[PDB]
Amino acid sequence: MNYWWVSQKQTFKQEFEGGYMWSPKENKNGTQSHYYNNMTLVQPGDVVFSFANGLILSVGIARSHAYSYNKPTEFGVNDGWKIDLEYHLVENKIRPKAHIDFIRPYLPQKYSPLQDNGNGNQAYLFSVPHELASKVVELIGSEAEEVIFGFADTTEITTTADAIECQISNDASIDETEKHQLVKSRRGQGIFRSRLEQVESRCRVTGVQLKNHLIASHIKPWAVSNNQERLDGHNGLLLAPHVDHLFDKGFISFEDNGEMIVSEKLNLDVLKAWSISQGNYGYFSKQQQEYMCYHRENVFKKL
Amino acid sequence: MNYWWVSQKQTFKQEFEGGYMWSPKENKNGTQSHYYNNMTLVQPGDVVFSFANGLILSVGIARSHAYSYNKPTEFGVAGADWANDGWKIDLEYHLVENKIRPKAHIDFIRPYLPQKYSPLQDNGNGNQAYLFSVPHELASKVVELIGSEAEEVIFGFADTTEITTTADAIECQISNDASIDETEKHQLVKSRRGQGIFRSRLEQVESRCRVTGVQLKNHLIASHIKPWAVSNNQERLDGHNGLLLAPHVDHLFDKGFISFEDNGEMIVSEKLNLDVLKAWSISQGNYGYFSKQQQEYMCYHRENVFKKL
Ligand SMILES: [Cl-]
Ligand SMILES: [Cl-]
Ligand SMILES: [Cl-]
Ligand SMILES: [Cl-]
Ligand SMILES: [Cl-]
Ligand SMILES: [Cl-]
Ligand SMILES: [Cl-]
Ligand SMILES: [Cl-]
Ligand SMILES: [Cl-]
Ligand SMILES: [Cl-]
Ligand SMILES: [Cl-]
Ligand SMILES: [Cl-]
């Protein structure tokens, strides 16, 4: 996932209401533009800071790649790049110049969105390097974190998995039954679900046994699992939907002997609100532990 | 959603272990029997009772239409080659602990058996064919005999499949529709999973899960009220056609286990086992007024999504 900083000093109102970003494709003199070319580098899931009227008004999430589209009609008045941007207004609408002594050390030598004095540069879309991105996020506060962790940063993972499902569904060589089972297993259906039900009986965390209230979740994700692992009843848990949400995204994981592990970026208010207690949720078998190790080391959100 | 009855006789274990059903597709002359043709009528999400050794052993959910596939095991007598090509269905088995013996309840079942093509004779002996249709009234009686385990498989689970199938087909149609504005297309598709302009607009009128109180954006699902699939394009992108919900509340609401009155009073379905609310520490009660714009959609939800009767 990449971060971008978009300077909309004079266009924000219109771009926010329409849920987009727009720029020309090239310079007036016909040459390639580093800054316009930034638009073609944006991927769904990427985080975009809206900088307008001196303020960061939104921490947004890109929902498209750049697509060719007509310049927006403005009242009283050639195709450019459009990006669908899912705006998220933040309560803490900050002015970056005020924190420049803290920010300056982490500004890039070239293509910086801010000058060394704290004033903005005059391009439209800047890349924000990852160290700097975290500093901006620090200043906005936890609401920027709400946009990112387990939200914006899940999108690229879903994109990758969507493409793996496409590779399988369109594979003209793979056995038809195998195709169906691998695809259905992604959403906890098919032989994977039946096999899991012979290993697990209930949601570890909430105790619910009712099959219509449980999600068949993989431990090692479906996307990175090989075909055996995708259909292995030992590579799963039956979880209540809110617990599936926390586990799938790596807000929680488990020790081999059952203790729930919590990510640094899980807000503890959530667990309080849903009456999920910390503690031990039972031994995992040796076969399950193989997968849970993978989850701890690759899915669980750990800086 | 339709119900079926598969008489698996002495090969339940192999068909269970393989997660399938298999039948011939035709007689030698190209004609189908009624029972071979039944395989071609099964749709994903349909419920299939596995009957073997006189017992109902599984309440399964079909996960495919019938597809051409070679006979999974050998015939008892080395048969003709044409007969090896049949219909396969991927069946998601769900074992039940309460294994009903239909013949021991024949007096209760007999009145609801069909005049023709029935899975059972009037004395409760099974018929010779493989896949039988179970009409809906007969199905309800079978479910009553099996009890809550059957209900668990069906309501909010098997019966959600056809709704997902429809929503998937619609997304495909929209995505490939050349006549739609490119930006509109992207917005309509993203809105299905609570993304894009729909979510930003919902955030202008709602701020938290009303049921759990959670305000954190990364722990909320942007749900529609009137479902995305049945909504028109204005309704799909309307921020008033939504609620922010914790994932488990999104689950209960989307499937119609709960709904809300216009003043926010939570309505709980008779199909909701109240143990679930206790296990997840969710209270009944009042969750605040909706706006007139939201009430339009909530009325639809109460009348068409909420599980009644
Ligand atoms: Cl050039
Ligand atoms: Cl460039
Ligand atoms: Cl400030
Ligand atoms: Cl200010
Ligand atoms: Cl840049
Ligand atoms: Cl297994
Ligand atoms: Cl461990
Ligand atoms: Cl016939
Ligand atoms: Cl076929
Ligand atoms: Cl008959
Ligand atoms: Cl008879
Ligand atoms: Cl019999």
Numbering used by the authors:
A (entry chain B): 1 to 77, 84 to 309
B (entry chain A): 1 to 309
Paper lines:
Modification dependent restriction endonucleases (MDREs) specifically target DNA that is modified, and are non-toxic to a host with non-modified DNA. EVE domains belong to the PUA superfamily, and are present in MDREs in combination with HNH nuclease domains. In all crystal structures, VcaM4I protomers have the predicted two domain architecture, with N-terminal domains of the PUA superfamily (residues 1–147), linker helices (148–178), and C-terminal HNH domains (residues 179–309).
The crystal form without DNA was phased experimentally. Except for the weaker diffracting crystals of VcaM4I with dsDNA, the resolution of the data reached around 1.5 Å. Although crystals without DNA, with ssDNA, and with dsDNA grew in different space groups, the protein conformation was remarkably similar in all structures, with the exception of two loops in proximity of the DNA (residues 24–34 and 72–84). In all crystal forms, the protomers dimerize via the HNH domains. The DNA binding site of the C-terminal HNH domains is consistently empty in all structures. The dimer of HNH domains alone is crescent-shaped and could accommodate dsDNA (∼20 Å in diameter). The VcaM4I alone and with 11-mer duplex generated scattering profiles that indicated ‘compact’ structures judging from the Kratky plot. At low concentration, the scattering data for VcaM4I and its complex with dsDNA were well modelled by the crystallographic structures (for the enzyme alone, with dsDNA bound to one EVE domain, or the mixture model).
